[PDB]
Amino acid sequence: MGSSHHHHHHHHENLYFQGSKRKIIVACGGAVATSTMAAEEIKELCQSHNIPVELIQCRVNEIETYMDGVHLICTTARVDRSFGDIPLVHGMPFVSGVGIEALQNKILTILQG
Known part of the structure; x- marks a missing residue:
């Protein structure tokens, strides 16, 4: 019917969205x-x-x-x-829970360029 093709059972495939655009990492500990x-x-x-x-x-x-x-x-x-150009940053004020509001604005300002 087409040399092995078209699955009626199910096309259980795995998408690779491990990119999109940018990927950030968060290091702290547990929870x-x-x-x-x-x-x-x-x-x-x-x-x-x-x-x-x-x-x-x-x-x-x-x-x-x-x-x-x-x-x-x-x-x-x-x-x-x-080392190299690892675009990392420290959220010292972000952890404060009080200086986030003000800092947030700064982050977005640069995030948009």
Whole structure:
């Protein structure tokens, strides 16, 4: 009927959306409200302006290993950011839970260019 083709059962395939555009990493630890705050915050923001991206989380020593296709890195003061051009940043004020509002504006300003 066409030399093996067209599946009636089901085309259970796996899409590769591990790119989109940019990929960021978050390094802190486990879950102490701080992590859930950033993830949710960065997610809501990324979607607020419809910015397709993939947010990944990692420990203090994982971003380097998973640094295959990361466009931005977020470490809580640990890395040196002096190797190559790893676009990482420290959310010191973001963790404060008070300086996020003001900082957020700054992040978006540069994020848009």
